[PDB]
Amino acid sequence: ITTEQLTTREVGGSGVFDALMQSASNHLLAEFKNNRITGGDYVKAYIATM
């Protein structure tokens, strides 16, 4: 087990932390594409879960 298996320092993926962030971002964007929230709410929730 190495550090690169935890996070690869990229937004893309191939890490546990990166995948955990991307899934939450995908769910928030899914709610965002429906006219239910704006950009600010999505950004704040993302930063909160970070």
């Binding site: 950009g39 600010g40 704040k44």
Partner: protein, 236 residues
């Protein structure tokens, strides 16, 4: 009088330093966010030119036999008309000055013989009416009759498309007002609690600068003339 690129580099090196629009060298705005800045700049210029009465311009309109309504649009300008749609234009232009629609308010209208024509006077048969702010009416057109329209004008449209106007004509005391208005628009558009608090500050700064410029009368807006009613009324 300076290019549009000077405006982009002033917004890149003034306000909006800390934002993500600017490029890495912080010398210019990215290609993605230029339409937003252009829209904001046009809105700000319209606001200022409506408030302050800076530019005064002129149009020459000649009268046809069967027309009473003369809309002031580029479709009827000589340099911009479509020959199949419009048989004969009535607004005269020049190859360098192509008469972009910049009419806010009509002040004076003068005949080709040097006599003034009353405007929007209901009880005067020989007067001109404006059904719409950019349309004229003359109920009795005549042969060899031409009219001159003296109107307050707004700034030409900035387009940055190799045919639009790159330059900006504005007094140097009102650059911060334009910058503050652009920053206000950009910071409101973010939709966060802190950005709105910053945008309120920028809008208040714009208002205070405009009020100061009015206070010191830097644009010479106030106008006074000699008294001629003394002789007309019969005084001695």
């Amino acid at each position: 009088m300076y290019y549009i690129e000077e405006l982009f580099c002033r917004l890149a090196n003034g306000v909006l330093n800390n934002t993500g629009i600017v490029t890495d060298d912080r010398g210019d705005i990215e290609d993605d966010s230029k339409p937003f800045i252009i829209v904001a700049a046009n809105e700000a210029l319209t606001r200022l030119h409506g408030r302050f009465n800076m530019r005064n311009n002129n149009v020459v309109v000649e009268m046809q036999e069967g027309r009473t309504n003369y809309p002031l649009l580029a479709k009827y300008a000589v340099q911009s008309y479509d020959p199949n749609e419009v048989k004969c234009p009535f607004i005269m232009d020049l190859a360098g000055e192509k008469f972009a629609e910049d009419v806010i308010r009509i002040l004076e209208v003068y005949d080709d013989k040097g006599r003034r024509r009353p405007l929007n006077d209901r009880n005067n048969p020989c007067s001109l009416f404006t059904p719409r702010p950019n349309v004229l009416q003359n109920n009795a057109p005549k042969a060899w009759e031409v009219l001159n329209v003296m109107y307050q004008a707004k700034h030409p449209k900035l387009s940055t498309a190799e045919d639009g106007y790159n330059e900006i004509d504005i007094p140097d005391t009102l650059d911060p007002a334009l910058d503050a208005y652009i920053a206000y628009r950009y910071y409101t558009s973010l939709n966060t609690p802190e950005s709105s608090a910053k945008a309120a500050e920028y809008l208040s700064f714009y208002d205070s600068i405009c009020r100061e410029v009015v206070e010191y009368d830097l644009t010479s807006d106030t106008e006074v003339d000699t008294n001629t009613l003394f002789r007309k009324r019969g005084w001695r």
